[PDB]
Every structure is written in structure tokens, then in C-alpha cells.
Design a protein around this ligand. Sequence first.
Ligand code: CLA
Ligand code: CLA
Ligand code: CLA
Ligand code: CLA
Ligand code: CLA
Ligand code: CLA
Ligand SMILES: CC1=C(/C=C/C(C)=C/C=C/C(C)=C/C=C/C=C(C)/C=C/C=C(C)/C=C/C2=C(C)CCCC2(C)C)C(C)(C)CCC1
Ligand code: SF4
Lengths: 74, 57, 80, 143, 408, 90, 31, 220, 160, 145
Amino acid sequence: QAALYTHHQYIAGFIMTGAFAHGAIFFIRDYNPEQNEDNVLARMLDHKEAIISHLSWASLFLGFHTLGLYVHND
Amino acid sequence: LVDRDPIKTSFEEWAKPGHFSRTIAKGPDTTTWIWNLHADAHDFDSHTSDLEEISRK
Amino acid sequence: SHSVKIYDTCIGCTQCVRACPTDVLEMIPWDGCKAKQIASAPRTEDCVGCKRCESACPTDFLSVRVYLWHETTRSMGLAY
Amino acid sequence: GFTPPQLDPNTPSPIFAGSTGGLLRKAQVEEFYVITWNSPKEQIFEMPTGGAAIMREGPNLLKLARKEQCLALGTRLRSKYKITYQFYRVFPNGEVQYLHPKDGVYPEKANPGREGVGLNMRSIGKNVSPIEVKFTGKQSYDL
Amino acid sequence: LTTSWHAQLSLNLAMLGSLTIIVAHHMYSMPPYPYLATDYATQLSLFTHHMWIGGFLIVGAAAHAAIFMVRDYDPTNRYNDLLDRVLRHRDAIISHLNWVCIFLGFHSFGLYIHNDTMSALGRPQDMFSDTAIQLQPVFAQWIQNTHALAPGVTAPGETASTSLTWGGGELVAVGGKVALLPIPLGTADFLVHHIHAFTIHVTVLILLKGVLFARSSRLIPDKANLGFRFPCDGPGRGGTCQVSAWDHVFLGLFWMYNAISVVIFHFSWKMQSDVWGSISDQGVVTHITGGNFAQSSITINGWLRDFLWAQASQVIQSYGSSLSAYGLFFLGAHFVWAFSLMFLFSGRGYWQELIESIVWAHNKLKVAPATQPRALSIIQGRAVGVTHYLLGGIATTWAFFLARIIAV
Amino acid sequence: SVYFDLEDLGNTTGQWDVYGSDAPSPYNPLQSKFFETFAAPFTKRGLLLKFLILGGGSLLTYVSANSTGDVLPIKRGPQEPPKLGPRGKL
Amino acid sequence: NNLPSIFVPLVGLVFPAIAMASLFLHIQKNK
Amino acid sequence: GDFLVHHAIALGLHTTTLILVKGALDARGSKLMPDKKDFGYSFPCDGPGRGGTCDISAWDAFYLAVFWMLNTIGWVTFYWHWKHITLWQGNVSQFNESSTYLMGWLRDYLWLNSSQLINGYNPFGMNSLSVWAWMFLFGHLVWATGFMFLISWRGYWQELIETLAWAHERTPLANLIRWKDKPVALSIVQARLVGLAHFSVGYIFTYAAFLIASTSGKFG
Amino acid sequence: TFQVVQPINGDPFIGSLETPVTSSPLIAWYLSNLPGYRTAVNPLLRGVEVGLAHGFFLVGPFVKAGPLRNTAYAGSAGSLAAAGLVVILSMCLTIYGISSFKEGEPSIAPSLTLTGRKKQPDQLQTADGWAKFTGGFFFGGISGVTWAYFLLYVLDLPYF
Amino acid sequence: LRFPRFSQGLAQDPTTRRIWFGIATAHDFESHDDITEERLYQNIFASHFGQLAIIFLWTSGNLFHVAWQGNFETWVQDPLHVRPIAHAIWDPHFGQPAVEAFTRGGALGPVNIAYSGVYQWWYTIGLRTNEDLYTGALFLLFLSA
Ligand code: CLA
Ligand code: CLA
Ligand code: CLA
Ligand code: CLA
Ligand code: CLA
Ligand code: CLA
Ligand SMILES: CC1=C(/C=C/C(C)=C/C=C/C(C)=C/C=C/C=C(C)/C=C/C=C(C)/C=C/C2=C(C)CCCC2(C)C)C(C)(C)CCC1
Ligand code: SF4
């Protein structure tokens, strides 16, 4: 059971990384700004800063408080 | 072989960080200035080319 | 050989040709700026790709661009 | 209106004791480089391959393995000793190719008659997207 | 030597580091203070401390030698024939040192992998050990025999030998504990000594290659114009990352750490297994670990099991007692050491691009500082990484050693 | 003090044979004749490779197949009764 | 059986050598 | 303890998603490199100008995200394995009490359960667990080996290689043999991939050996 | 003042130096007489000599250090392993010769001596010469291994 | 031209970088010389076929080894007191204690204990004898062909 669980979870992680890698490859190679004017795909490149900053805030908050609680218990 | 009162004792240079260098003393446009202040603190050879002053320091 | 390009945002201060470690860049007469000069790259087969020219460009974004390309025995700096 | 100078094989070389940073099999199989200059007095200079050498007064000749080495030596000469120089590229078959200053006028000075190579009459931000040049042998630049 | 401050500093640093290592080696086998041999924690702490100080000073010597080579070298007015001749055949020196390092690494560490494979396959009779294939250090045993017989023959004025570790046979016990006694040498000492030699040779190779090629090379003929501390010369020539003399010191610090850690581990295990112990009324010696160094240290699995796993139970069980500070420092140093890999494995461009997004939201709320935030430089990032790495490793070893040796 | 020449580039580029010797053969004619007569068939690089592959494949396989347990412990097989695993498993 | 005494050396020593020789010859070829 | 480990898992997921999304969105260019789309998906750098541009491509953004994925999956698998081991042994209280602090993890999961692994072969004999201990050490070796490619960079190695060519060319009885391809050090992008591969292989092999041996020694 | 180390052949701009290790008369005589430096002799004979010398050598380590060193089959196993190693080396030599040399081209060996005298280039640097050398090496290696085995375990000589 | 056949720029590299980069860009059909969309799609289709064939061969090999060297028939009778066998071991480097230690289950020699759960999966879906596994392996070989 443990072997199957670990195997499948690691494979899923690798596949999840590959999905984002190929998404970036698509953005570099196949994206056409003119044909995709002001649609859902183009409007995410407009406010990328907000998404990145909010992700950074969430990560920092989670890490800060989890590490603080663990060190306090230790 | 000594010199009488080479340098005056004053607090003037305390209020001007980076006085030892011409570039650093200009001002902190970016945050690299703060790091460059500490990395070149004790490099007396970069401050001046006079061997006597380096030996005295 | 690598590819080196010059764009018409040039101001002709001759800073790129002086920083070239080989003989790749040179200056030619031009009209379109106060200095009446523009850079050129006639000897890109001697390019090594250290990108010292881009370290000397004062324009906001570079008026000289180096694109790394097929490698030869000259562009790899080999003296075997 | 400029003819390249000829290379004189009888030019003496500077005084050097030898080193392990000299030529190798690439010089025998491929090209190597020769740099010549004229000195007003005998003086000591730093070799690009390591060590120190004494240049002779008058014509001097030297063989090197790379264009970077000879250009660095020439830059040092012009900066410190104020000496004019030229260097060549020599092929294994026996042909000599004159390389620098290639005009008699140094590159940093604008000289009429030079042709423009690699000039793009636009800003760097006007390059087309990679999708517009797909399935073709061309690139976004040089277009 | 009367005009440059850096050369004198390099020479003095090298000599001082060598002297510190000599002092560390001499203090343990010739206890100069009363009731010091039976205080095991003090002996271990002093030994490790002085070894680390000597290593750091030795590295600094090479660093300042490279600094002098870059800055103050001038053949026009300060010509020297000996320095000129060395720089004219550096390729042979570097190639020979490379071959020596490769040979020592193959013929020292390779014997450990052979023993592990033979033990795993079930063939204990095909291993390099005292019972199957002996590799005896016959030269050191001859020195021990000569020094044990020195009084009365070559030192008539002496009554006893200089040290009790030479093999005289006499044992000194103070307060029921063993102070000093003869130390045997076998197959394991051969392997560990050759490991020490291999590590030292690699460190010397790195530092000397950094010093010798400080001014120029076949790759970058004008390296002296770029200075002593510069990150690179661009992605050209296939890549020119870490070509400066500063990067060679940055790289050799890791190898110094490795060598000193191996040496201190050898010292600790050997003293705990063959020297330290307790004596009874009948005069039977019971060592701390029971003399398992001879047969267990010949494999990497033995080092992992009988040394790292067995002796770390003191620090991981120190919670709730007066030794819990060492237990906290163990995990703190683990965290500090692991934290350094972020600076070493990554690059500046990613962090500069990430900051741009963070600055955007500060501009939205009118909290953007006028001192524009910039990512750390390449050299600064490398320095931070190496500093945190060294601090974490040394603190971990310190906590482990103190927690183990204070309890037992 | 002239080290550059265009009509002679062999000396200019250092194309020398440092230790090559042009002395005649020191071996006996009869021994040499015997060696050329008997070692001739192995001088064809096309056939030598195939012969080496076939011989190595046939010799290595034949030895392994007919090996006796007195040499290979794995050819001898187990000689002790097996022991039960955890939880009373085979 | 006796098959493992043949197939194991055949796969571990002979085929790798043949493949390596052929691949080296192929990658070292020029026209 | 489930609360704490679940929040750690969430932190790992959020950080990995942040890295991957930042890499994907800034692929066409940014303020530091406005024309990144003209240089392709994978390229080493843009030189030391403008402060330095180390790891500026999207390929390096993917390369930095593999470590975080490995860390998150390691945390998840550690949690699962410890919880199920404690459940199977019938001593669930140990996990309940010892999982609220990190020293509890280090002492009651890694140190305690690795006794049978490191005793596969000893100076007294061996048993059926020898191969798992050998794989444990092999994975440690590969994982440590990846650090050489990850930490040291190219310019140190090209200079070292340049001397070996001279040594070979100047050695008698050996200069009669010459190469066909000129030896060079590994490129900037290649070394990152090699180090990442070594890191991942060591991680996977070491954890697999530990997990399998620790479960099978106790429960068959 | 007298000096020992000299630039190679008087040319200080070639990356080599002349030292007693390289240019001693004893060392110069010793190296010129090795079979690998006899450029005017049939490559087959030089290959045979090299094969014999190397094949005689390889028996000892295999015999004394092999897994069957403490059994009655030590010598046969060591000789068989030495023969296998000789076969592998012959395969490597054949592959190198095939990959490096092309049929019909002239030799690439230098045709100038240290004193400037012209000489015929060595024929070892051609396809036919290398094939002859490899065949001679194989034959000599097999013969040397056989001779070493015969001397060691067919004649009861008081060795060791 | 030489290796790689699909890259003119790499084939003229005089260094060892030609081999390393030649291996690492084989399956990037988009960057090959004289490439079109149709050729790209056809190459992708062929690669998918090859991947399916490889998967079928792998499964067939697993089944054949379990049938030939396993203990499936005795495991069926007593599932809870038998350790499944993956395959046999023939290592010339083994010593005698290694041969003794790895001889477990009902095997007559060294073996490996399977941890992939193939025994329970095959037992659940109705396979009961060694003759079934041989037929499955043959069918999978036919599918791969
Ligand atoms: C154990 C090692 C370690 C640690 C602790 C971290 C921690 C972190 N990484 Mg990280 N990383 C690591 C290894 C590590 N990484 C490795 C090996 C890689 C691969 C190269 C990466 C790649 C990576 C990327 C790509 C990114 C991160 C990011 C982050 C941060 C977001 C997580 C968070 O919530 O912050 C929690 C905060 C902390 C844990 C900091 C604790 C603060 C304490 C109180 C400092 C106290 C200072 C001292 C005691 C006081 C002065 C004393 C004096 C002596 C100094 C976080 C600081 C992200 C980031 O920076 O953006 C958000 C990001 O984008 N990491
Ligand atoms: C007698 C000993 C001695 C002396 C006098 C010097 C003197 C010098 N060294 Mg030096 N050095 C030494 C030993 C010595 N070194 C040793 C042993 C090493 C090897 C490790 C080095 C390695 C070294 C390098 C690599 C460099 C120098 C440089 C220099 C010069 C500039 C110093 C400077 O700006 O530092 C400024 C000092 C600091 C920034 C302080 C560093 C802070 C330390 C590392 C962290 C301590 C952690 C601490 C425990 C945490 C608490 C923090 C707190 C705020 C909470 C100066 C001439 C530099 C130079 O010449 O450049 C041209 C240079 O690049 N040295
Ligand atoms: C008073 C100053 C100030 C203010 C109002 C903010 C406000 C903000 N920061 Mg922030 N920040 C600051 C200083 C400040 N920061 C400093 C000095 C640093 C460098 C350590 C950072 C580093 C930072 C990061 C890395 C991130 C933010 C983010 C954010 C936003 C999310 C809210 C939050 O709690 O983030 C968390 C805030 C912190 C972790 C900052 C730490 C607290 C600092 C040390 C307080 C120092 C105040 C300073 C000394 C003022 C002196 C006043 C005195 C002169 C009277 C929010 C708009 C996040 C965001 O959304 O991205 C845009 C995010 O990811 N900040
Ligand atoms: C995966 C395939 C594989 C196989 C099947 C073997 C098999 C063997 N190895 Mg081995 N090995 C391998 C991989 C392999 N190895 C790898 C990858 C390494 C590197 C880590 C080693 C490193 C290694 C060492 C260091 C040693 C072995 C030894 C042995 C032999 C065990 C002792 C014995 O029976 O002596 C009996 C041996 C003989 C009677 C003579 C040798 C067998 C044949 C007859 C020699 C001639 C074969 C053929 C003509 C030449 C090659 C043909 C070519 C096409 C391959 C055995 C034949 C030991 C040994 O004795 O080697 C000689 C030994 O000391 N191996
Ligand atoms: C555990 C990881 C690890 C390992 C194994 C090594 C190993 C090595 N490093 Mg190193 N290094 C590491 C981490 C590591 N490093 C890290 C983290 C850094 C910091 C960036 C460095 C920085 C560094 C520098 C700066 C230098 C080295 C050098 C060397 C080499 C020393 C000379 C030599 O050949 O040794 C002997 C080799 C070994 C002991 C490794 C082989 C292990 C055994 C023998 C395997 C043998 C298998 C056998 C060949 C059969 C294989 C066949 C196959 C089919 C299985 C050696 C290969 C130096 C170098 O280039 O050479 C002089 C050098 O200058 N390293
Ligand atoms: C450098 C480390 C090292 C050394 C010295 C050895 C040594 C040995 N191993 Mg071994 N091994 C090692 C690493 C090492 N191993 C590693 C890392 C592994 C794991 C991959 C193994 C796995 C392994 C196995 C599985 C087996 C061995 C075995 C053996 C023994 C037999 C080897 C043999 O047949 O002769 C090999 C030697 C030669 C063919 C010739 C060597 C001659 C040397 C090079 C001298 C030449 C230099 C000379 C002085 C130059 C002179 C200059 C000139 C001018 C004259 C031998 C004692 C076998 C055994 O039974 O052990 C008892 C065995 O079965 N090893
Ligand atoms: C009924 C029910 C329910 C429901 C649930 C749900 C509804 C869920 C959901 C879920 C979800 C909702 C999920 C999601 C996910 C997502 C993801 C995972 C994503 C990803 C992404 C990506 C990967 C991207 C990519 C890209 C890019 C980046 C760019 C270009 C384009 C593309 C697209 C390629 C519950 C359980 C409550 C309860 C019970 C009942
Ligand atoms: S990249 Fe380097 S070599 Fe090429 S033109 Fe610019 S400065 Fe000159």
C-alpha cells in the first residue's frame, strides 16, 4: 500500500510540474497577441503582478505561522 | 619619524557614511549602497594609494 | 557564428567598439543623431559572446544586441 | 584607397626564455596569429601567455594562438607604451590575412567608405512575435 | 616584502594556521595541565576548536596571496626571477596535482566501496581488513617502536618517553579513569590517513590553481584588468562562470570544511574507542564504545551506523534536562545549513524579476520606498550561501559533540 | 633570432618528431618472416572485429553455461532449510 | 533451469559491447 | 498534528504554484529583459550587465520548482507513512503525542525506524535486507554527487580541462593517440539538468529503500 | 651563468620546455628504441613486441588477486581473465583504427626531425599500418599470456 | 553532414558538445531543419504508436516472469501466509550467505519478493493458474506486434 501510494503521488507531482512547463512553452512559442485581443487569455497577462503578489503573500503568511508554531512547540 | 596631529578628532565624519570612498559617499539611490558600505569597510588600499597612510591605518 | 545587430536608437558615443575584446565592431558615418555616427558589426565571425558591448550601452534598452548561435572554434575561445 | 602592409618574415622576436603557454597542434592544423610593432627603446612587458619579456628597439614580431591575445597585447601597448601595431592571421597552407586596423584607421574613429552591416532601421521593441516566423528558416531579428 | 602588506599577511596567516594545527596535535598527547587528560569534553573541544581555526587561517593565506598577485604584482619595477619561473610552467604543476588528486581519490575512497560491496554480497574474506587482506602502516609502527626505545639509548638523559602513546606499555589512571595509554595502528588508520592526504591535496590543488591563474589564462588573456573580485565575463566562450580568484577561495572553503570534519570525526571515534575508558580494582579497562573502531570503521555503513546513529542518541534525548540547549541547537543548525541551499542553487535574475511584482502593490498603496529595492549581487549571494553553509555544519557538529561527550 | 618563416611552416609551427628513430629493423630476418607468415590473417580490420565479437560471445557463454558449483556459489544453490518470515510467512 | 546462465551474460556483457561499438562508429562517422 | 501537517502541505503547494505561475507569466518578457521572447524558452543568461541576469529564463523557473515539488511530496509521504505505521503497530498514541514538534519527528520516525535498515550487513553477517541498505547508501551518494554540479559552475572547469590537453599532448607514448572531438566543459544549462537528475534519483532511491525495508522488516 | 632548462628546440614561443627529464641523452636513447618509436620498421613486428610485453604482464594481478586466488583453479582463471582483457583491448584498438583513419590517405605523422632534417613519415598513422599493428598486438598478447601461464603452472619453477 | 542528422548547426560543432546536445534535442520535432506541420503531426502519431507498443511489451514481460518464476498457484490457496515472488536472481558476484539469505518463499533459489500488488489484482479478476498468465503474455505480445 505504501509503495503504491508513494509511487503514484510522485508521478502526479512530476506530471503537475510538466503541465506548467508546457504552458510556459506555449506562451513563448504559440501565443498570438493579435488574434487573442482582449479575451480571457489576454487579460491575465494584464494583471500578472496582482496574482504573483497575492501568491507571495499567501505563501509568506502560511510559512511564517507554521514555522512559528512548530518552533514554539519544540 | 612621527607627524604631529595629522588628523583632527571630530564627529563630522560620523554623520556622513561612506566618507572613505568617493562613489559610496554620493548617496543611496538603491539598496546596493548599504551592502557596498560594509563590504569595503576595511579595504584600506582602495581608499587611498599612499603607503604611509595605509600603514598608519 | 553569433549574430550582432544595431538599432536606430544609436547615439554614437563609440562605447561599444572600445569595449570589444576582439575586432568585431566599428563606427561608420550616419545622419539621424547629434553625433552623426552609428555602430556596425562587419566581423561577427570573430564574436565570442562575452556581451561586453551590452554592458556599455547607455540607451535605456540596448541599441546593440548579441544573439548566441551556432558555435565554432573561434566563438568558443579554444587555443588547443 | 588603402593597401595593407606586407609581412616581413625577417623581423626579430623579443627576448623570451620560453613557457608552456605557447602554440599547440591547432597552430599546425589551423590558423595562428602574428603581431608586429615598432618600439623606440628596449623595455620589459608582460606576455599574455604568462611571464615577462623584453622587447627589442625597432621592429618586433610575435606569434600567438588567438585573436583575443594579440588584441589584448596591442591594447596594452597602445595604452602604456604609445605604440602602433598591426596583426595578421596565418593559415597552414601559407596565406597571410591582414586583420587590424583593417583600414589604417582604428575602429573607434568614424571613417568614410565603411559599409553598414547588421543595421535594423527600427527600435528593438518592434520585432515580430515568434509565431509570425514559424515553419520558416528566418528569425525575429534580421527581418 | 617591504612594500606590499598583502604578501606579509598571506605568509603570516599560513604560518599561524600551520602552528595552530601543530598545537592542536601536540596538546592532546602531552597533557600540560593537571587533571586535563581525564576531562574528555575539554580535550575534544580544544582539539576541534584549534583545528578549525588553523584551517580558516590557512584558507585566508591563499586568499591574500591571490589578492597580492592581482594587485601589487609589477615586473617593471619589482622583478623577481623565482616568481617569473613559477608562472612560466604553471600548466605542468596544475596537471601533476590533478593527476595526484585523482589517483589518491581512486586508491583511497575506492577501497571503502570495495569493502561495502564485499560485505553486502556476503564475502567478508575478500575485504581489506586485519583478518582478510591486511594493509599495515609499517612505517608509522617503526617510528613508534623507535620512540618507545628512545630513553637510555638515544636520549640517555631522559627517564621516560616524551609521550605515552608511542607504545611504552605503561598506563596512567587518575581517579578511576584512563588518562593515556599506547595507541595501536592497524588497517583502518592506513585508510583514514590516506583519506586525509587526499582531501588535503584536493584543497591545495584548488587554492594553488586559484592563485596561479589570477592574472591571465588561455581562456581570458586579460583577467587582471577585471580585478580580483568579479562574477564572470559573460556567457561567451561556452560559459565563464566563476573565473576570478575570489571564486577559488569560495570553492576551497567547502573542501577545507570537508577535510576538517573528517579529521575531527576520526579523532573522536579513535579516542572514544581505543583510549578513553574506566579502570577497575583488578586493572581491567572498559572503553566507552568497547573497541569497535578496528572492525567497524572499514566501511561507510559502519561509519553511518556505529558512529552517527549510535552516538546521536544523547543529543536527540536531551529534552527535559539541562542539556536541552544542545538539542535545540542541533535542529537550529540543521535549519541554518538547509537554508543556505537557496542562495547556492539559484540565480539573481529570478529574484530581481520577483521583486518587480512586489514593488507594484506597494506603489498601489503609496508605500513604495525611494531607495529602490535591488536583489543581491552574484558575489554577495555566493558569500551568503557559503557563510550559512559553514555556520550550519559547524554548529551541528558542535552541538552533537558537546551533547555526546558531556553525558558520557 | 628569427622564428617565423613562410617558405618553411614545419619549423614555424613546431612539427617535429622528438623521439622518432629512422634506424633499420633490429629483429632477425627469420623470426620476422615467421611472424609475418603466421600473424598475417589478423591484419584485416574488417574481419578482425567480427572474429573478436563472435569469439568473445561464444567463449564467454560456453564457460558460464557449463560452470560447476565448485566455482560459482550461485550454481551450487542453497544448502540450508529456509526460515519463516515475519507474521509466520513463508 | 539453465537459461539464466546464458541470457544474463548475453544481455549484460555482449550486447552492451556491440551496441557501444556500433554507436561510437555511427557518431564518429563523416562524409 | 494533522492540522499542522496539512497547513505545511498547503504552504508547499502554494509556493510551488507561485514559482510555476511566475515562470509562465513572465515568459514573454519583463522589465529586466523586455525582449525575452526573442531568445527562446531555454537560454543561460543575458550577461552580467544591468546588475546580473542569472537564471532569467522560464526553463530556470521550471528548474527551481522541482525542488519544491520534491519537498512537498516528501512531507506528504512522511505524514502518510508515519500515521499508517503507528496505526498498524497498534500504538496510535505515539503519533498523536510526538507529531506536534519536529524533534519528535526526527527521533520517533527517522532514527527509530532505521535500525533494521542499517543492520542489513554488519561485521558479523548479513541478511535479506542487505540490498536495501546498499541502495540507501547508493542514493545518499548520488544525492550528494548532484551538489557538485549544482554549486560549482563552468569557468572553473574549462581552465582545468585546458591543462589536461597540454599534459596529454606533451606525454611520450601517449601523444601517438589523439582525440577527434575537442574536449570542453559542460554548458551552463546542461549542468543544471545533470545536477537536477542526480538530486531526484538520489531522493527517490533513498526514500524507496528506507520505506520498503522499514515496512517489510516489521510486517513482512 | 650556466642554465639547465631551455626552450624547446630554441623556440621560446612553442608551449614546451626542455628539461633533463625530457632531453637527457640516456632518456633520449631509451625512448627512441621502444617499438612504438621505430618509424622505419614494419608495424606488425612492433605490434607483436608490444602485445607480447603487455600480455606477459597482465597474468599476475588477475592470478594473485582474483576471487579464486585461494583455490586450485587460480592460474587457469587468471589466465582466462587476462586473455579476455587482451581481447577487449584488441577490440578497442580495432575500433579506434577504423574510426580515426581513412583508406587511401597519406600518413599524418610529422616528417621533420628535431635538427631540421627531412624524413619519411611513420606508416603507423595509416589504416593499413594500424590494422597490421592491431593484428600483431592481438597475436603477441595471446602468445605472451600462454607463455606466462606455461611457465607459472606447467613448470614447477621455484618462484617467490 | 553527420550526427545529428536533424541539426545542421550542431553537426558542425568541433567539440564534444555535439554529442550531448544531439542526444538532448532528438524529440523536439519543432526545432528540426526543414520541418513542416504535417511532418510534425505524422511523427507524433508514430511516436504514440511506439509508446503503446512499449507499454504492451512491458506488461507482457511482467506476466511472463510471474508465470515462469513465481509462486502464484500456491499463493492462491493461502493468500495471507505466502510471500509473492517477482522473479529469480542469477548474480555471479553472490557469495554463499547471499544465496542462502535470498532463498525465501517456496523457491529453490534466490528470488525477489514483489511489492507491486500484481498478485492480488490478477487473483481478483479471475486468474487462477499459470496457464492463464502464459496466454495473457502471448496476447500482449501479439498486441505489441
Ligand atoms: C530549509 C531551507 C529553505 C528555507 C527555510 C526556505 C524558505 C523560503 N523560501 Mg526557499 N528554497 C530552498 C530552501 C529553503 N527555502 C531551496 C533549496 C530552493 C531551491 C533553490 C528554494 C527555492 C525557492 C524559491 C524559488 C522561492 C523560495 C521562497 C521561499 C520563502 C517563502 C516561504 C515562506 O513562507 O517564508 C517563510 C519565512 C521564513 C521561513 C523566514 C524566517 C524568518 C526568521 C525569523 C529570520 C530570523 C533572522 C534572525 C534570527 C534575526 C537576526 C539574527 C542575525 C544573526 C541574522 C521562504 C523564506 C519564495 C520567496 O522568497 O518568495 C515568497 C520563492 O519564490 N524558495
Ligand atoms: C589576520 C587576519 C585577517 C585580516 C587582517 C584580513 C584583512 C582583510 N581581508 Mg581577509 N581573510 C582572512 C583573514 C584576514 N583578513 C581569512 C582567514 C580569510 C579566509 C576565510 C579571509 C578572506 C577574505 C576574503 C575572501 C576577502 C578578504 C578581504 C580582506 C580585506 C578587506 C576586509 C573587509 O572589508 O572585510 C569586511 C568585513 C566584514 C564584511 C565582516 C564579515 C562578517 C562575517 C563574515 C560574518 C560573521 C557572522 C556572525 C557570527 C553573525 C553575527 C552577525 C550580527 C550582526 C548579529 C582586508 C585587508 C577582502 C579583500 O581584500 O577584497 C579586496 C575579500 O574579498 N578576506
Ligand atoms: C511600513 C512599511 C510597509 C508597509 C505598509 C508594507 C505593506 C505591505 N507589504 Mg511589505 N515590506 C516592508 C515594509 C512595508 N510593507 C519591508 C521593509 C520589507 C522588506 C523586509 C517588506 C517586504 C514585503 C514582502 C516580501 C511582501 C510584502 C507585502 C506587503 C503587502 C501585504 C501585507 C503584509 O502584511 O505583507 C507582509 C509584510 C511584511 C512581511 C513586511 C515585514 C514587516 C516590516 C519589516 C515592517 C518594517 C516597517 C518599517 C521599519 C517602517 C518604519 C517606520 C518608521 C520610519 C516610523 C502590504 C501592502 C507582500 C505583498 O503583497 O507583496 C506586494 C509580500 O509578499 N512586503
Ligand atoms: C552485468 C553484467 C555482468 C556480468 C554477467 C558479470 C560477471 C562476472 N564478473 Mg563482473 N562487473 C560488471 C558486470 C558484470 N559482471 C560491472 C558492471 C562491473 C563494474 C562495477 C564489474 C566488475 C567486476 C570485477 C571487478 C570483477 C568481476 C568479476 C566477474 C566474474 C565473477 C568471478 C568469476 O566467475 O571468475 C571466473 C572468471 C573466469 C573463469 C574468466 C573470466 C570469464 C571469461 C571466460 C573471460 C573471457 C570472456 C570473453 C572471451 C572476453 C569478453 C568478450 C566480450 C564480447 C564481452 C563474472 C564472470 C570478477 C572476475 O573474476 O573477473 C575476471 C572480478 O574480479 N566483475
Ligand atoms: C559526493 C559528492 C561528490 C563526489 C563523489 C565528488 C568527487 C570528486 N570531486 Mg567534487 N565536489 C562536490 C561533491 C562531490 N565531488 C561538491 C558538493 C563540491 C562543491 C561545489 C565539489 C567541488 C569540487 C572541486 C572544486 C573539485 C572537485 C573534484 C573532484 C574529484 C577529485 C579527483 C578524483 O577523481 O577523485 C576520485 C574520484 C572518486 C573517488 C569518485 C569515484 C567513486 C568510485 C571510485 C566509483 C568508481 C566506479 C568505477 C569507475 C566503475 C564505474 C563503471 C560504471 C559502469 C558503473 C572527484 C571526482 C576535483 C577535480 O575535478 O578533480 C581533481 C576539483 O578540483 N570537486
Ligand atoms: C581503487 C580501488 C580498488 C582496488 C584497488 C580494488 C582491487 C580489487 N578488487 Mg575491487 N572494487 C572497487 C574498487 C577497487 N577494487 C569498487 C569501487 C567496486 C565496486 C564497483 C569494486 C568491486 C569489486 C568486485 C565485485 C570484485 C573486486 C575484486 C577486486 C580484487 C581483484 C581485482 C582484479 O582482478 O585485478 C584487477 C587489476 C588488474 C587487472 C591490473 C592492475 C594493475 C595495476 C593497475 C598496476 C599498474 C600500475 C603500475 C604500478 C604502473 C607502473 C609504471 C610503469 C612505468 C611500469 C582486487 C584486490 C574481486 C575480488 O575477488 O576481490 C578479492 C571481485 O570479485 N572488486
Ligand atoms: C460535487 C462535489 C464536490 C465538488 C468539488 C469540486 C467542484 C472541485 C473542484 C476542483 C477544481 C476546480 C480543481 C481545479 C484544478 C485546476 C488546475 C490543476 C489548473 C492548472 C492549470 C494549468 C496547468 C495551466 C496551464 C496553462 C498555462 C499556465 C498557460 C497557457 C495555458 C495553459 C492552460 C496550458 C465536493 C468535493 C465539494 C463535495 C462532494 C460533491
Ligand atoms: S558579444 Fe563580446 S565579442 Fe561579440 S561584439 Fe559584443 S563585446 Fe565583441
